[PDB]
Design an enzyme around this catalytic site. Structure first.
Site, PDB file in Angstrom:
ATOM      1  N   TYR A   1      -9.625  -0.565   1.089  1.00 37.21           N
ATOM      2  CA  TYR A   1      -9.175  -0.391   2.457  1.00 37.21           C
ATOM      3  C   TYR A   1      -9.189   1.095   2.802  1.00 37.21           C
ATOM      4  O   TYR A   1      -8.976   1.948   1.955  1.00 37.21           O
ATOM      5  CB  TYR A   1      -7.774  -0.800   2.744  1.00 37.21           C
ATOM      6  CG  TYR A   1      -7.164  -2.035   2.098  1.00 37.21           C
ATOM      7  CD1 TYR A   1      -7.599  -3.300   2.530  1.00 37.21           C
ATOM      8  CD2 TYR A   1      -6.180  -1.932   1.107  1.00 37.21           C
ATOM      9  CE1 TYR A   1      -7.088  -4.468   1.969  1.00 37.21           C
ATOM     10  CE2 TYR A   1      -5.656  -3.102   0.551  1.00 37.21           C
ATOM     11  CZ  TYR A   1      -6.110  -4.363   0.968  1.00 37.21           C
ATOM     12  OH  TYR A   1      -5.574  -5.499   0.378  1.00 37.21           O
TER      13      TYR A   1
ATOM     14  N   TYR B   1      -7.326   3.345   6.005  1.00 34.93           N
ATOM     15  CA  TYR B   1      -6.489   3.259   7.184  1.00 34.93           C
ATOM     16  C   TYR B   1      -6.281   4.611   7.844  1.00 34.93           C
ATOM     17  O   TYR B   1      -5.966   5.605   7.173  1.00 34.93           O
ATOM     18  CB  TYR B   1      -5.096   2.755   6.818  1.00 34.93           C
ATOM     19  CG  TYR B   1      -5.002   1.433   6.093  1.00 34.93           C
ATOM     20  CD1 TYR B   1      -5.060   0.234   6.785  1.00 34.93           C
ATOM     21  CD2 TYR B   1      -4.792   1.392   4.724  1.00 34.93           C
ATOM     22  CE1 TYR B   1      -4.930  -0.975   6.131  1.00 34.93           C
ATOM     23  CE2 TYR B   1      -4.656   0.197   4.058  1.00 34.93           C
ATOM     24  CZ  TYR B   1      -4.725  -0.984   4.766  1.00 34.93           C
ATOM     25  OH  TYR B   1      -4.583  -2.179   4.109  1.00 34.93           O
TER      26      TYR B   1
ATOM     27  N   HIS C   1      -5.559 -11.162   9.423  1.00 29.48           N
ATOM     28  CA  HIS C   1      -6.987 -10.948   9.272  1.00 29.48           C
ATOM     29  C   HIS C   1      -7.653 -12.161   8.659  1.00 29.48           C
ATOM     30  O   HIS C   1      -7.488 -12.459   7.468  1.00 29.48           O
ATOM     31  CB  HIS C   1      -7.207  -9.702   8.402  1.00 29.48           C
ATOM     32  CG  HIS C   1      -8.610  -9.178   8.421  1.00 29.48           C
ATOM     33  ND1 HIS C   1      -9.001  -8.104   7.646  1.00 29.48           N
ATOM     34  CD2 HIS C   1      -9.708  -9.571   9.108  1.00 29.48           C
ATOM     35  CE1 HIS C   1     -10.286  -7.860   7.860  1.00 29.48           C
ATOM     36  NE2 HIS C   1     -10.730  -8.722   8.757  1.00 29.48           N
TER      37      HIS C   1
ATOM     38  N   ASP D   1       0.841  -1.186   0.000  1.00 24.19           N
ATOM     39  CA  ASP D   1       0.000   0.000   0.000  1.00 24.19           C
ATOM     40  C   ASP D   1       0.886   1.251   0.000  1.00 24.19           C
ATOM     41  O   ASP D   1       0.605   2.229  -0.702  1.00 24.19           O
ATOM     42  CB  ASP D   1      -0.964  -0.011   1.202  1.00 24.19           C
ATOM     43  CG  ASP D   1      -2.113  -1.020   1.054  1.00 24.19           C
ATOM     44  OD1 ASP D   1      -2.326  -1.571  -0.040  1.00 24.19           O
ATOM     45  OD2 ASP D   1      -2.833  -1.250   2.055  1.00 24.19           O
TER      46      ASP D   1
HETATM   47 CL   LIG Z   1      -9.271  -6.078   4.695  1.00 18.59          CL
HETATM   48 CU   LIG Z   2      -7.826  -7.040   6.452  1.00 23.65          CU
END
Ligand SMILES: [Cl-]
Ligand SMILES: [Cu+2]
Ligand SMILES: [Cu+2]
Ligand SMILES: [K+]
Ligand SMILES: [K+]
Ligand code: NA
Ligand code: NA
Lengths: 620, 620
Positions: free
Chosen positions: A374, A376, A584, A290
């Site tokens: 995503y 963050y 995750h 990322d």
């Molecule tokens: Cl995720």
């Molecule tokens: Cu995740």
């Protein structure tokens, strides 16, 4: 006049001008990365030279360049052509993303795959994903993206609810060719929508939440000067922003009586990778850097008052470059504020009759970014007691797949027929240490259990040990939660009043590190993620744990390469790189939009001060 | 009304009257413990029987008794004389603590020891500490406290700054005899004061802290009914208080649509032990069971608005018994409030154009207690997303000693000549589970790494495994941070809409467990603290991991005895006992009063809900 000030719009347009005049920014050129360089060691002896580093892509196929310019003097310091097959491809362009969907839309193989599944091509979104390096020789030296399909039933529909499994395409975004379309077979496209603003799905909204009002009637306790220099409760620092790393903290120091004492020279999240653990060939190549591939700073959100940041907020609006060298402001992209943090210290003493309570607070510097599905939040905290902390908040929508009939060892079920492949989010914090100055060392500290016997006849004793990391070959360390392992950064030449070297102790969360097989491409390209703590000797050009050009790099770049120099780190200018992450296994509760989960680390003073640094906090 | 209501003053007075009437509470008797019992398994309606359990001490030296009374029916249910040498001594009486310094002040051995150190007996405070069980055969069946001396220079002086090392005394607090005085030699008494309100030490107080105002214009979002029943943001529970355990949470449940779904039947901190790791005979016996020996609830602080609890606070003022059976209120001993908790969920979607942000909140239920030099905060949190969390906050003044010339492997230096022995603070949370009801089971979940090869040719796959704990013999588990080990409590008879048993996942901090040699008295007495997780079959008389009578009690009771029954725990009424703690090597920054440090655990829903439970939260 601070050399750590944020880049101005004018500085960026000045870079543009220098580049164009030098003949380096023709119509086929795109800026893939642009950022100000930090001052070199020993630069304060005056004479500002603001330099910017630029990665220039060429959409016509010509070689990319890395260019350093001086905006102070209006010059090109250096311009080097890159051999991308050797040193890696440039970061993904925001503008290259749309390209994948558009190219696939007219490809016969792709259309055939969609037709078999009865999907309207106009409704098929394609996630433009980084390619990595696998078995495809034809890809070496080419800019490739891979694409996975998601159906969007209407303009405001969440396409993530409708993954199209068994299908993946590879595209060369420069030659504009679809190199491969792989169709392993049809999987039902999950049909339930994931529209978390649809009253049909949310049900009636709660009316039970009463307001919580957070105000500061006399304003905040911190000051901001020179645009980004913060002073708060003995702390001093500069808040930088870089399009790759996001918020960066510089010159973290603490005013202890009459001395401004440095603690950390530069703190940043220097990489973050999201490796997927589904062995399906549809996704087995999937690893998002990322930070290194996508650049998290460029996608920083504009943060809304009362919504994203609550209370008395001071904003920074950093400026970045677009693909053409024009400055773009990220309005209210950084939140700064102080928060109450409960009890700081408390004792009710029978003998003295004194009852004492003090409250704690922390300074918060944060931003929030969106990387495809995503989102963050990156938060740095400074506490009254000298503690420094980082916390990442992970949310957004999980990346989905089909859920296989018969289940899966590598994918969880979120909704009927909807899968979520297992993955990790692994961060690297790069901490250029300066505990009371640059002469630092790191010790690994373990609890030591003792055997009952002579000198310990009751078997109650326990102790600890410290091992100095003396050379880089010895400085790649793993967690040991069972033995309470921490790492202390100290200054062997600066001692507290009890004649001990001043120090700060790093407390890790001891979450799992990279799970992939050690022989995998991802283990080689994200080697940093395989171990919890690395210490290197400082060097100008060692910025990221994954190297400068992460995209489609074959492996071994960054930390493994730095560490191989085996430099002296025992009482030297050193950098700590801490790996920490979330593993995750998505749960039903993560769907259709995931509640925040968190990970981070902290450092606490360890004999840095001569006594508690908060005895001068007044009663509330 | 509710059988889970707090004990009232009248109930306590009535227990006193019933005991008196029964001949069990004459003038030589003292109440060492008194608490209401929870209702029996097997419902009721409003056919309530409020029963109280009492431990009755006798100051004349006659055998103590354990008695259960029905305050409803005015009856003694059971009364049994205790053989304390076998089953353990009663908890220490607040009145016995002062006995120690008083008796020592006229003991010739003690006076000689003080004279050797040129200390005025009038200025010598004695910390009167629990005795444990060691090699002193004469102590068996006797109530002993051990005393350690500290000089207090003037009435408001912090005596902890001035430990008198090399000296310890043992005292029989019933016969009022000094049984032993041990003097291993003089150590310098540290001279620096530790007076954290002395401006000479604090320096001028900061004037830099601007106010942070936290208010709720419309009041709080939770309701309190029946004195202690809380409803907040789908959560339902009853807040209990017990003199031994402190705050106890009952009937934690979550309203999911039209259904009140149980999660945890009873949550408490059922023991806490503070073992010291200094092999000096002056302190090698030192182990506080703050809960089991001292009773943490009885020393609960009155919490001040604006200082201890900030914001819109609702207080409970629990009532406990004094040593004679009279009720005593702890005014404002429990704080309840909700606070903002940052971002709950956030996604900015490119494809849909929808930007979504929601904020989080948590309900807080807390108390703070003082045990001599130490002050501990106990905090329970309920989050919007279904997460349940506990946090302990440790502060106060560290327990001190001399710092040996030439250093120590078991003591750190805080100030010139002043040491702080290494120790731990280890908690046991007892979670009587009721995931969707009482039919529950526990699985240990580990991450599973996979080898590159057939079916995983890229070496990216990773997975996990779950092992059901089927019988108590298999249910004593250790942490494995490296493999991301967690424990899931599920209901095998209640499945979510995806046909998976509903569950909650326990996330431990994976801090070190008890460090003492397994052959030590403390390893036997605090056996629970040697392992991270225990699972038992529910039983009425299995309340504490250390048994009912911890004071001067050897091994033989508590969790190791319970687990031996090897009962079925696979889909049964079960109880999880989680050990978690801090290992404290004190730092200079901990002196002269310690900044808060924390430890805890949380449970997150794991397919308990059919999708995110917070989709109905409104925009801020
Ligand atoms: Cl995720
Ligand atoms: Cu995740
Ligand atoms: Cu401690
Ligand atoms: K290469
Ligand atoms: K009655
Ligand atoms: Na450094
Ligand atoms: Na149970």
């Amino acid at each position: 006049a601070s050399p750590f000030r944020l880049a101005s719009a004018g500085e960026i347009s000045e870079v543009q001008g220098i580049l164009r005049t030098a003949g380096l920014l023709g119509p086929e050129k795109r800026i893939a990365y642009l950022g100000v360089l930090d001052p070199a060691r020993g630069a304060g002896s005056e004479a500002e030279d603001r330099r910017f580093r630029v990665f220039i892509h060429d959409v016509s196929g010509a070689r990319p360049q890395e260019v350093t310019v001086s905006v102070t003097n209006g010059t090109v310091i250096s311009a080097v052509e890159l051999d991308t097959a050797a040193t890696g491809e440039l970061p993904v362009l925001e503008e290259e993303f749309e390209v994948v969907e558009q190219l696939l839309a007219t490809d016969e193989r792709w259309l055939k795959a969609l037709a078999a599944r009865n999907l309207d091509v106009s409704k098929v979104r394609v996630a433009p994903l980084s390619a990595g390096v696998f078995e495809y020789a034809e890809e070496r030296g080419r800019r490739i993206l891979r694409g996975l399909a998601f159906v969007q039933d209407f303009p405001e529909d969440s396409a993530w609810a409708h993954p199209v499994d068994g299908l993946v395409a590879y595209v060369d975004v420069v030659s504009k060719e679809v190199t491969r379309v792989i169709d392993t077979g049809v999987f039902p496209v999950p049909a339930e929508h994931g529209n978390y603003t649809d009253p049909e799905l949310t049900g009636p909204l709660r009316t039970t939440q009463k307001p919580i009002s957070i105000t500061q009637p006399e304003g905040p306790s911190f000051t901001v000067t020179g645009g980004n220099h913060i002073e708060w409760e003995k702390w001093s620092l500069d808040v930088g922003f870089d399009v790759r790393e996001g918020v960066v903290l510089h010159n973290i120091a603490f005013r202890d009586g009459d001395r401004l004492r440095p603690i950390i020279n530069r703190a940043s999240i220097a990489e973050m990778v999201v490796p997927y653990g589904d062995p399906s060939p549809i996704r087995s190549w999937q690893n998002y850097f990322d930070t290194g591939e996508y650049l998290v700073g460029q996608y920083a959100n504009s943060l809304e008052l009362g919504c994203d940041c609550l209370g008395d907020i001071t904003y920074l609006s950093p400026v970045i470059s677009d693909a053409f060298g024009n400055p773009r402001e990220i309005r209210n992209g950084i939140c700064m504020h102080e928060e109450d943090w409960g009890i700081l210290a408390k004792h009710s003493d029978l003998w003295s009759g004194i009852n004492y309570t003090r409250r704690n607070r922390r300074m918060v510097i944060s931003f929030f970014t969106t990387i495809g599905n995503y989102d963050y939040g990156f938060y740095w905290y400074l506490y009254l007691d000298g503690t420094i902390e980082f916390e990442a908040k992970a949310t957004g929508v999980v990346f989905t797949s089909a859920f296989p009939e018969g289940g899966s060892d590598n994918i969880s079920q979120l909704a009927p027929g909807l899968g979520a492949p297992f993955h990790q989010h692994i961060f690297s914090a790069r901490l250029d240490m300066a505990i009371d100055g640059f002469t630092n060392r790191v010790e690994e500290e373990d609890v030591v259990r003792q055997t009952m016997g002579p000198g310990n006849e009751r078997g109650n004793a326990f102790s600890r040990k410290r091992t100095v990391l003396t050379r880089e070959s010895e400085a790649v360390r793993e967690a040991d939660a069972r033995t309470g392992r921490t790492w202390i950064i100290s200054n062997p030449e600066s001692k507290n009043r009890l004649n001990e070297p001043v120090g700060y102790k790093l407390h890790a969360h001891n979450q799992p590190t990279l799970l992939a097989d050690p022989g995998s491409s991802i283990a080689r390209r994200a080697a940093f993620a395989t171990k919890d703590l690395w210490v290197t000797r400082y060097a100008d050009d060692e910025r990221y744990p994954t190297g400068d050009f992460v995209n489609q790099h074959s492996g071994g770049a960054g930390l493994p390469s730095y560490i191989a120099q085996d430099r002296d780190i025992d009482g030297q200018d050193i950098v700590v790189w801490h790996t920490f992450g979330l593993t995750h296994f998505p749960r039903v509760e993560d769907w259709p939009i995931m509640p925040v989960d968190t990970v981070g680390f902290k450092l606490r003073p360890e004999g840095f001060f001569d006594r508690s640094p908060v005895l001068d906090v007044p009663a509330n």
